[PDB]
Every structure is written in structure tokens, then in C-alpha cells.
Amino acid sequence: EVQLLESGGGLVQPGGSLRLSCAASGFTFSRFAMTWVRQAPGKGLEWVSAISGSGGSTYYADSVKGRFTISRDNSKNTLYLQMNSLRAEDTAVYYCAKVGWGAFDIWGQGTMVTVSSASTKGPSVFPLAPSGGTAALGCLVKDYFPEPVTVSWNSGALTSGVHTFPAVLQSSGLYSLSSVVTVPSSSLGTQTYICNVNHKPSNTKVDKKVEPK
Amino acid sequence: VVQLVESGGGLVKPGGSLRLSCAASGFTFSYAWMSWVRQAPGKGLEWVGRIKRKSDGGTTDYAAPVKGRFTISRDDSKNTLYLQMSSLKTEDTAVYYCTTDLCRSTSCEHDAFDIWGQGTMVTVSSASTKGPSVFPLAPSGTAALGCLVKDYFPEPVTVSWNSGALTSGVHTFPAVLQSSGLYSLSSVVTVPSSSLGTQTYICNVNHKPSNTKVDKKVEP
Amino acid sequence: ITNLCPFGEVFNATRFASVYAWNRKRISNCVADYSVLYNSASFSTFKCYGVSPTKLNDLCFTNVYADSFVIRGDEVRQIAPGQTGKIADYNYKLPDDFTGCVIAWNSNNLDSKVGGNYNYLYRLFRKSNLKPFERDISTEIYQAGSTPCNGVEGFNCYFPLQSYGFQPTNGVGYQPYRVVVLSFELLHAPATVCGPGS
Amino acid sequence: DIQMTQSPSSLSASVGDRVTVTCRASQSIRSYLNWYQQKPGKAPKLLIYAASSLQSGVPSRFSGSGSGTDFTLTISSLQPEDFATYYCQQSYTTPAITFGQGTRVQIKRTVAAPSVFIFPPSDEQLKSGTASVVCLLNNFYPREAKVQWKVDNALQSGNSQESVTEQDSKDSTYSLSSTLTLSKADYEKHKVYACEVTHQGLSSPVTKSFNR
Amino acid sequence: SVLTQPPSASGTPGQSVSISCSGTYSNIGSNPVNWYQQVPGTAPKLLIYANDQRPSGVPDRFSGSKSATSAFLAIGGLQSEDDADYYCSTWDDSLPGPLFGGGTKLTVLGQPKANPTVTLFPPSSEELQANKATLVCLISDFYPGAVTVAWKADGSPVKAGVETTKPSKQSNNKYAASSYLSLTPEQWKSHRSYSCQVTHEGSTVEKTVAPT
Ligand SMILES: *[C@@H]1O[C@H](CO)[C@@H](O[C@@H]2O[C@H](CO)[C@@H](O[C@@H]3O[C@H](CO)[C@@H](O)[C@H](O)[C@@H]3O)[C@H](O)[C@H]2NC(C)=O)[C@H](O)[C@H]1NC(C)=O
């Protein structure tokens, strides 16, 4: 019934700005105070800011005080978050929640805001050559930014035995991941194990064949 | 000390819409359940709806005959309860009371209505407004004098005697509906016949729907 | 000729108090047959601390107090001495050296309402826990954090009370339960409340 | 939906007698039953809450009892100020509150002869074209009365309109008005206009007249 | 001014557990405590408000408790759907907004333990000819989902170039992870062997590669 739809999230560079949005549904938006709570990747939760029912009262954490500005529009059942002077530490999934009896009872599914300071860069793909009757080969896609990538084998021809591991975020600020295919030693059939990596934000398409060493 | 005063309402054509307000004072409006109860002419009390206080959800509940047409809202900022009526029918013609319950202490008894407003009359019909005509009922041990409020619509009309100084023996009859389609009543008062020489009697007639105020002197 | 204690007025009451504003009646100068209650089978809970129900009819006290109120079935355990939670800490707190009994029974057929019985309330917020037999009937806006409240409800400011909203369809753990607490105070004064065996 | 039923619909008792009003619900409402008093022209007043509890300030003459589906309102010694309609109301179903149809409680008292006055039409009303003659029936009981208009010596039929006030809260008497409506010409044509009243308190049919 | 929780917790299905959360009298002692459940990839769900009150829809096996400076979340009858991270939260008398604890990962041991599969790849010749070297070591099909990876060059612990992901659940509900060692082509050829050591539940499996 009660629904909180968030939007307005994306990538931005330090010093940039971004306005988040959350549309309320299923309850009287004017009678309940709203709050923003962010969750850094792989870390915990942190209260960002709060707003009164009519907007007469604003509340901000010291970590975002003087930069972020919360506000709502009761004529549209929408709450807004205006973020300015963004820092790399401000990177987190920002959640939209309703305040009730000292707790946040209903939460939104969240929108991701990214503070990077890195360039849209195409990846460098290198093969991973193989060598109990099962061979494992793959190709490594290195130093790509930002997410995501799409790796397939023989243009989607081979599906079974392909494991694409989640990407690692290096101190580079650039991502890296690996895809591996586990086939039996009857490897002469699909003689060409080609890995097709696509980075659309970079529009970088690079194909690489992984021949057994 | 606790008080509720309804405002709004009057003549409205079928299908129209009205918004009744009622003002609260003398008690913490934010902590009180607020209800509406109506009564048609000589028909008995009917529960209309209710909005709970914020602490218990502030949810509304409406009686079946008005569900989907009436909207109840509260504004704790201004200590005012609202009833938004739409698709008004002639069956909705009644006096609308606003009321709260017996929970302003340690013993809580919700929906036991101990505080009521004066109620505002809401009339739903196709007829139009018409101001009344006041004629004196001049008197002749005990003499009788009064005033005749002839042709008016809709209800109600206010009549007093010497601005509230004369109340003993005052009889303000219920309004009869003439064959013309408009109402008429009379207000009479018995006084000592020796009172006519020393005291002067004038009736204060007021018809708010027509915005008419008349002070007529009944002379012997 | 014996004067019997007015227990029915406490047990068989049309309305029970809300636990936050719990009610206390003094019992004095009468004879109470406690085994009648212990063997009544109408009580889902009958726990006596500091005495045994078998010896109640043979003991005497200078003063007896009957505390009554309504709470959830799953909150009756908090009435015992040395417990914590919403009821023990914020609403009704028995002392750790409590001498008396605790009697409760299901009242779903009395205190429940279709669509919720909001007449029974409990305190939800309090900065300090209640001391034994303390009674807090305040309705001041509770403040959570540092922002002053100015007496208005808002983001960090809440009404201290909340209703139970007992419904007859609620699970037994949430159904209303009437509770009667009997405390046995004994001083170096003449005892006036006795059992039949004395 | 719980429906509330009251009995009797109306009753009339002498001052100082005990009166009983019953209330029935289509299904058990436990103890969530309230009683209200509504005097004519006023808002309802809460008398009894929780079946048996008396509201503060309400006279001790009022009491209530009952449980489940059957309840009773009792007035130990009916007083003239107790003229009103009494309603019972259930709150067992929180989302759907319902009232009873109400019971009219009236006061029996000794016969009281009416003081009858007749008012000729206004001179200003005669200018407007209409003519109204008001006949006052003041402070009489019982309410049963017969008002016959007889212009000259002929009894009239369909030009009279009656309205009666509610029972007075102090002396428990009624007051009635009968208005004869005619056009200026018909009023100018005839002479003597008589208001004949016959009542239990009147030794004879009393007839007040005016000539013009 | 900070809430502290034990970082992890474990239990067999059916068992009960208790999640702790310590602080000051200015936070947990003088302000109400909340609890939130969060399964990865979703929004936190409210489990306990006002210290020990369950919002609508929360089963009774979730319990709340509080001492002087600490709060506790009890989970009876551990179920598969309770594998999530639980956050305590409360207010501090010196701050305008609420505080959150570091979290506590509760692992429900639904499946029997599974040792990790290790696959270490040497650097590619193409990458070497590009003046770079990266050792990729993939860990797959291990439960519970927690591993420690340690790189070594000729036994000595590596001191730089190690980037490792967090565990991630797979289609078989077993977990996977990967580790990377960024070396220069000179360092890759300046040692006899590099080893990837993946620890899981005390025991550690090892895979090694050597320059060719
Ligand atoms: C509150 O009201 C209930 C009834 O609504 C009272 O319960 C009554 O309790 C007495 C005590 O046991 C019962 O008396 C017994 O009757 C059985 C046969 O039914 C007999 O075998 C026993 O030896 C004993 O005489 C009684 O039946 C029971 N019900 C009624 C209608 O009286 C209860 O006592 C009241 N609470 C207080 C504190 O007074």
C-alpha cells in the first residue's frame, strides 16, 4: 500500500551537485515527517537529514550540514534532497523513509549516487589461459570505469559453465573483474573460446580469443 | 471551558457541495477524536463519520449512507474539524453537529460524546432564498403581543425580544410550511396589561440565509 | 458474623484502568478467602511471590492493596518482580522484594472492539524507568535527541501514550488480559485483612 | 452493522414517577452503550456512558443498566425539565457507530385551561394583499384542542394552519397557534371573525372575536 | 556518541540468538532504541521500535530488550529468511538525528559446510608485453560465505597490490569471491613462485603458479 519511489541518482564528480527525489503513495504525506538515510557500499547506515510535515522544521547531520538541503512538496506527495559540494565520502545508496514513533517504519528501495572523480575509460581485456578432466579458461577485463560491463562467450553461443565474478574496486578508482569458463577436456570442439566484453558508457567493444596454452 | 462551534452550511442545490467547519477551544484538539453527527428535521440522530487523533493513526471512518461522498479532515494547526460534502441529496438535509468524546483524562471512553456543538442547518432543495416579512401582532389582566415572520426560505430564523431582556412567556412557534412553499412562524409573549404603558416591546428577527435583520416595535 | 472483602468490585468491573494510569484500591478490615481465587480456574496466571496460595487463607496482613489494569497476554510476564520491558519499565513496576500475588485472565470477550479498542493505553516513551509502585499519568510531548519540541509533535517529538487497539480477531498473545495485583504489606501495627483460618 | 432499537417510541408520565426506556442491539455490544438526552432546540447531552456510569453533572435520578444486547435507561423521579428525546448509542463496532431511533418522554400534568387571544391582520399586510389572523392558545394541557374558525357565522375549512410549541420545561404546558390566511378582498368583504376553541380545561367552547 | 555491535553472529535453523548493541546513558539509556533488518540488495525493514515494540507484520519470534547502556535483539526459531544484517539505532541527547550501529551479519547455517574451490591464473603474455602483471585467483562454491585470501611471494607475505572483492552468493546459494595481485613484470620474474591461500572456517587451501 504505502510506497516510496526514489529517483534522481547517478554519477557525479567532486564538487558537483545532484537533486534526489522520492514520491510518496498510499498515505497522507502532510501528516508524517520524512527523513533521508544513506548506506555507503559495503558499510552501514547513516542518517542524513529530516523534514517536518509542512517543511517548517529541517534537520541535518553535521557531516552534510551547510551543503545538503532537504525539502518536500505536499502538492505532489514528493520529498526532495538537494546535494551540493559532493564529496567522495557522500557516495552511498540514499534511502527514503517515513518517520513513525521514533523509528523509520517504511523505507524506499533506494537510489545510488556516486562520487568518483574518475574518467569514463574503456577496459583492457587479457586472456586467462588454461593449463581432473575439466579445463577452466577465461579472460580478465582490467581498469574499466564506470560500471557496468557485459561479458559473453562467442556472442552468447556458449552459456553453460560461464561464471562472471563481481568486479573489484581498486584504489585506481577503476573496476576490474574476471569471467571464466569451465569445460571438460573435450575442448577441441568450440576451438575458439572468444570472450566479448562491452562497455557502453565507454562504447568500448573488444573481443579476445582465449587459446589453451 | 471546552467548546465546539460549527460554521458554514445553508441552502444548496442537489448535487452541489458544501464544506462545514467547526472550531475547537478549551481542550487539546490534537489529542481528541472528532466526529460528525447529523439530525434531519424530527428524524433522530445519525452518525456521519469520525477522524481519530494523530497518535492513533488519524484514520477516518464514514457511515454507509455517506461513504464516498463526504470527506472528513482535521487541521490541528487551527483546531478546526472539516466535513466536505459532495453529491448532496435532499436526504442530506439536516442539522450537522460536531462532537468529541470522553477521553480528556485518565479514563478513556472513545465515542462517548460529551461535548457537542450548536449545529448548523444544511438545506438541500431546488427552491431559492427569500427574506421574511415581519408584521406586528398588536395587543388589545394579561395581554398578548407578538410578531409574525411571514414568508421566508430556507430555515432557520432567529427571533428574540428586546435583545434578550424579555424571555419570560416568550413562545416562538415551530415554522409551518405554507402551500406557497415557504415557511412562516409567530413569536408571542404574554405581559401584564399595565406593562404596555410603561414598557416597550420590540421583536428582533434575523434570517441569516437571506441576510435580513429586522427590529419591529409592537405598539398597543 | 464476618466482614468479607469486596473482591468482586475489583475483579468483576465493567471497565479496567489503562496500565499507565493503573488503579489502586485499599483493602482493610475484612476477611478474604484467597483459595477461592487460586482454585477458580478462570485465571490464566496466579503467581504469588513472598507467600504461598496454600497458606494465604491462614495469614493476616495490616494492609492489602489491589492494583488492576489491562495489558497484552504476552506482557503478563513483565508483572513479576525483577523483569524489564515496556510495561515493567514505563507503566507498572513491581518491587524486587514484592510480597503478594499476581492474577490475570483473558478478557478478549470484554475489552476488545470490532475495529480496535483504543480506550486502553500504555506509555511508550520515558527517559527514566519507573520505580516500584510509581504512577506516571503525564501526557507531555516526549523529546528524542537534542532538538527542543516547543510542545508540538514532529520528527523527534512524540506523544508518550499509544493505544492497544484490542480486536477480537487478534492472536492470544495480543488479546487484552485483565490483571489484578494483590500486595501484602505488614507493619508493626494491628493486622486487619485476614484469611478464614485465623 | 449493529442496529439499535428503543422502546417505547413515546411515553407520558406524571412528575415524580419512575420511567424506563429500553435499548436493543441486533448483536451483542458488550458494555459499549451510551445514553443521550436531547431537549428541543438543543444539542444532545450525554447522560450515561459504559452502560452504567453516570456523566458528571447529570442528576442522580438518571441511571442505566444492561449488558450484551439489552439495556435500560431509568429516571427515578421524572421532572418537568426532563422532557426530551432519549437516544442509546453503541460503540462496539468502532468503524460504524449507530444510534437508536429515540424515545420521546413527555410530562403528564393537571388540566390547564388555555388563554385564547385573537389578532386581526396587520395594516401593512393588508397593503401587501394578504391577511393573517393569529389565534393564540397559551399554556394549556393536554395538547388535544379544537380550533374552529368562523368568519361571520360560517365555519371555515381549508385556510387555517396550526403550529404548537414543545412542552415547556417549567410548567409542562403546550401553546398552539392557528393562522387563517385570506386575500385582502375576502377579508374586506366580511365583518366579524371568531376563533372558537374547545378544550378539556374550558367549561364551555370559548370564542374570541373581532369586528372589521 | 557511537553505537557498537558485534560484527557477526551464527546459528543453526530453529536455534535462538541475541544481537547486542552497546552505548552510553545519553543514547540507549535516555532514548528509545530501534532495530532494522536488511537482506542484501534491499531496504532495511523495521523490526523493533520503542525498545521492545513490534510493528505490524513482524512475527513474535523477534524480541527486543534493553539494559542500562545496551540493547538486545532476540531471534527465536532462526529461519533461512533471517540471514541478513541487523542494525540497532537510537537517539543521542547531543544530536538532532538518530545514530546507527555498525551492523551485525547473522548467518543461518542452512546448508552443510562446503570447502572453497581455488583457481589461480598466472599473468598473460599479452599483459606482460604491455608492461603489466596481474595474478587472478578465483574462489567459488564455499559456504558459509566468508573467506580470507593471502598472497605470498616465495613464502614471504605480500605487502602491496592485493585487491579482493567481498563474498557474493551464486545461483546454487553457495558463495564466490575473487582476489587480484597487481605486480610489475620485473617482480613477477624476480620470484620462483606465487601462492594464493584461501582460508575458510580455519582450514586453508592453496594454489601456486610460477613464471614460465
Ligand atoms: C466474579 O463473577 C463470577 C461469576 O460471574 C464469580 O464466580 C462464581 O465463583 C464462585 C466461587 O467458586 C462459584 O461458586 C461455586 O459454585 C460451584 C457450582 O457452580 C460449587 O461447586 C462451588 O463449591 C461454589 O459454590 C460460582 O459458581 C461462580 N459463578 C457465579 C455466577 O457465581 C466470581 O466469584 C466473581 N469474582 C469475585 C472476586 O467475587
Q: SS3 of B209, please?
A: helix
* Strands, sheet with A194-199, edge to edge from the N-terminal-most edge strand: A150-153, A194-199, A204-209
Phi and psi dihedrals of C108, rounded to 5? Answer: -60, -30
Q: CA of C155: which chain A residue's CA is closest? A: A33
From the list D50, D52, D94, the residue facing C114 with the nearest CB is D94
Is-same-fold flag (B3-124; B133-218)? yes
D185, with CB counted inside 10 A (0-12, 13-18, 19+), is exposed
d(CA E31, CA B76): 27
Report the Cα B183 to chain-centroid distance in Å.
16
Phi and psi dihedrals of E197, rounded to 5? Answer: -110, 115
d(CA B82, CA E69): 46
E strand or H helix at B24: strand B17-25
d(CA E137, CA E121): 6
d(CA A118, CA D30): 71
Contact check, Cβ <8 Å, B45/D44 = yes
D193, with CB counted inside 10 A (0-12, 13-18, 19+), is buried
Q: Which of A123, A115, A118, A116 is nearest to A148 (CA)?
A: A123
* Strands, sheet with B3-7, edge to edge from the N-terminal-most edge strand: B3-7, B17-25, B80-86, B70-75
DSSP strand pairing (E133-142 vs A175-184): unpaired
Choose the CATH number for B133-218 among 2.60.40.10, 1.10.10.60, 3.40.190.10, 1.10.40.50: 2.60.40.10
Q: SS3 of E29, please?
A: helix
Joined grid coordinates for residue E36: 532494522
User: Which residues does chain C have within 8 Å of residue E92's beta carbon, measured at their own beta carbons?
Assistant: 145-146
Which atom of ligand 1 lies nearest, measured to the CA of C11? 38
- Interface contacts (C, D; CB < 8 Å): 27
Whether the bond between D40 and the residue before it is cis, its omega within 30 degrees of 0, is no
DSSP strand pairing (B11-12 vs A175-184): unpaired
Joined grid coordinates for residue B144: 398578548
Whether the bond between B156 and the residue before it is cis, its omega within 30 degrees of 0, is yes
CA-based nearest distance C63→chain E, Å: 34
CA-based nearest distance A47→chain C, Å: 13
For residue B130, the 8-state DSSP code is: B
Interface of B with D in 160-219 (CB under 8 A): 171-176, 178, 184-186, 188, 190
B125 HSE (CA, 13 A, CB side) = 14
E strand or H helix at E138: strand E133-142
Most ligand 1 atoms within 8 A of CB, residue of C4, C12, C16 to mutate: C12
Q: Kindly state whether E162 is in contact with chain A, defined as any CB-CB distance less than 8 angstroms.
A: no
Q: SS3 of E148, please?
A: strand
Find where cell 404548537 sits: D164
Please tell me the residue having the least CA distance from ligand 1 atom 34. C8
Q: Which of C145, C19, C172, C14 is nearest to C88 (CA)?
A: C19
d(CA B209, CA B120): 12
d(CA E142, CA E125): 31
CATH classification code of D115-211: 2.60.40.10
**CATH 2.60.40.10 spans which residues of chain D?**
4-108, 115-211
Gyration radius (Cα) of chain A, Å: 23
d(CA B130, CA B157): 12
D68 HSE (CA, 13 A, CB side) = 2
Which atom of ligand 1 lies nearest, measured to the CA of C10? 38
Residues β-bridged to residue C177? C71, C106
E strand or H helix at C35: helix C34-38
E strand or H helix at A71: strand A69-73
- CB distance B213 to B164 below 8 Å: no
For residue C36, the 8-state DSSP code is: H
Contact check, Cβ <8 Å, A28/B58 = yes
From the list C115, C119, C153, the residue facing B108 with the nearest CB is C119
C172: Cβ below 6 Å to ligand 1?
A: no
**DSSP codes of every residue in C66-116:** EEEEEEEGGGGGGGSTT--SHHHHHT----TT--EEEEEEE-HHHH--BT-
d(CA C121, CA C71): 9
End-to-end Cα distance, chain B:
44
d(CA D127, CA C81): 91
Q: Which of A93, A83, A98, A104 is nearest to A24 (CA)?
A: A98
- The answer for residues whose C-beta is within 8 angstroms of residue C8's C-beta and 6 or more apart is none
From the list B47, B109, B176, the residue facing D161 with the nearest CB is B176
Neighbouring chains of C at 3+ CB pairs under 8 Å are A, B, D, E
Find where cell 529530516 sits: A50
How many Cβ atoms from other residues are within 10 Å of residue C66's Cβ?
21
Interface of B with D in 11-70 (CB under 8 A): 35, 37, 44-47, 50, 61, 63-64
C92, with CB counted inside 10 A (0-12, 13-18, 19+), is buried
Q: CA of C145: which chain E residue's CA is closest? A: E93
Q: Which residue type is seen at B119?
A: G
Q: Which residue type is seen at E30?
A: S
Joined grid coordinates for residue B22: 467547526
d(CA A95, CA A46): 10
Domain D4-108 fold is: Immunoglobulin-like (2.60.40)
Please tell me the residue having the least CA distance from ligand 1 atom 28. C40
Joined grid coordinates for residue A110: 533506494
Cα(C110) to centroid of ligand 1, in Å? 18
C8: Cβ below 6 Å to ligand 1?
A: yes
- CB distance C133 to C93 below 8 Å: yes
Phi and psi dihedrals of A152, rounded to 5? Answer: -135, 165
- Long-range contacts of A51-55, Cβ-Cβ distance < 8 Å, separation of 24 or more: A51/A79, A51/C155, A52/C154, A52/C155, A53/C154, A54/A30
- CB distance C67 to C18 below 8 Å: no
Joined grid coordinates for residue A26: 498510499
DSSP strand pairing (E8-11 vs E105-108): parallel
d(CA B191, CA B145): 8
Cα(C144) to centroid of ligand 1, in Å? 49
Q: Which of B54, B37, B49 is nearest to B98 (CA)?
A: B37
User: Which residues does chain A have within 8 Å of residue C147's beta carbon, measured at their own beta carbons?
Assistant: 59
The answer regarding whether domain A3-115 maps to CATH 2.60.40.10 reads yes
Cα–Cα–Cα angle for A26, A27, A29, rounded to 5 degrees: 125
DSSP strand pairing (A58-60 vs A45-51): antiparallel
d(CA B37, CA B51): 12
How many Cβ atoms from other residues are within 10 Å of residue D174's Cβ?
22
Find where cell 487463607 sits: C57
Alpha-carbon separation of residue C72 from C20, C121, D43 (angstroms): 13, 11, 38
The answer regarding whether domain A124-210 maps to CATH 3.40.50.80 reads no
d(CA B133, CA B148): 8
Cα(C54) to centroid of ligand 1, in Å? 19
Kindly provide the b/e burial profile for residues A139-177, where b requires at least 16 CB atoms within 10 angstroms of the residue's own CB: bbbbbbbbeebebbbbeeebeeebbbbebbbbebebbbb
Joined grid coordinates for residue D21: 426506556
User: Which residues does chain B have within 8 Å of residue C120's beta carbon, measured at their own beta carbons?
Assistant: 108
**DSSP codes of every residue in E108-125:** E--S--BPPEEEEEPPPH
Q: What share of chain C is helix, strand, coil (3-state, %, to 5)?
A: 20, 30, 55
Kindly provide the b/e burial profile for residues D137-157, where b requires at least 16 CB atoms within 10 angstroms of the residue's own CB: bbbbbeeebebebebeeeeee
- The answer for residues whose C-beta is within 8 angstroms of residue A139's C-beta and 6 or more apart is A125, A126, A127, A128, A151, A178, A179, A195, A197, A208, A210
- CB distance E69 to E75 below 8 Å: no
Q: Which of D30, D22, D20, D21 is nearest to D69 (CA)?
A: D30
Choose the CATH number for B3-124 among 3.10.20.30, 1.10.10.10, 2.60.40.10, 3.40.50.460: 2.60.40.10
Q: Which residue type is seen at C129?
A: N
- The answer for residues whose C-beta is within 8 angstroms of residue A161's C-beta and 6 or more apart is A181, A182, A183
C41: Cβ below 6 Å to ligand 1?
A: no
Per-domain residue ranges for chain B? 3-124, 133-218
d(CA E165, CA A175): 11
| Chain C residues contacting D via beta carbons under 8 Å | 14-15, 109-110, 113-118
E strand or H helix at E128: helix E125-129
Greatest CA separation for chain B = 66
How many Cβ atoms from other residues are within 10 Å of residue C29's Cβ?
10
d(CA B56, CA E43): 26
Q: CA of C20: which chain B residue's CA is closest? A: B106
Q: CA of B109: which chain C residue's CA is closest? A: C119
DSSP strand pairing (A69-73 vs A58-60): unpaired
C12: Cβ below 6 Å to ligand 1?
A: yes
Report the Cα A201 to chain-centroid distance in Å.
14
- CB distance C125 to C144 below 8 Å: yes
For residue E127, the 8-state DSSP code is: H
- CB distance B175 to B183 below 8 Å: yes
D209 HSE (CA, 13 A, CB side) = 14
d(CA A178, CA A186): 23
d(CA B46, CA E39): 51
E strand or H helix at A152: strand A150-153
- CB distance B183 to B177 below 8 Å: yes
Alpha-carbon separation of residue C91 from C84, C85, C95, C125, C139 (angstroms): 11, 9, 13, 10, 13
d(CA A74, CA A85): 27
Q: Which of B126, B147, B143 is nearest to B207 (CA)?
A: B147
Three-state SS string over B137-183 comes to ECCCCEEEEEEEEEEEECCCCEEEECCCCCCCCEEECCCEECCCCCE
**DSSP codes of every residue in chain D:** ---EEEE-SEEEEETT--EEEEEEESS--TT-EEEEEE-TTS--EEEEETTTEEPTTS-TTEEEEEETTEEEEEESS--GGG-EEEEEEE-SBTTS-EE---EEEEEE---B--EEEEEPPPHHHHHHTEEEEEEEEEEEBSS--EEEEEETTEEP-SSEEEEEPPPPTTT--EEEEEEEEEEHHHHHH--EEEEEEE-TT-SS-EEEEEE-
Q: CA of B76: which chain A residue's CA is closest? A: A31
Contact check, Cβ <8 Å, C119/B110 = yes
d(CA D152, CA E208): 134
Contact check, Cβ <8 Å, E101/A140 = no
CA-based nearest distance C195→chain B, Å: 33
User: Which residues does chain D have within 8 Å of residue B109's beta carbon, measured at their own beta carbons?
Assistant: 49-50
Sketch out chain E's domains with CATH numbers. Answer: 8-108 (2.60.40.10), 117-209 (2.60.40.10)
- CB distance B117 to B6 below 8 Å: yes
How many Cβ atoms from other residues are within 10 Å of residue C157's Cβ?
20
d(CA A111, CA A98): 16
E115, with CB counted inside 10 A (0-12, 13-18, 19+), is middle
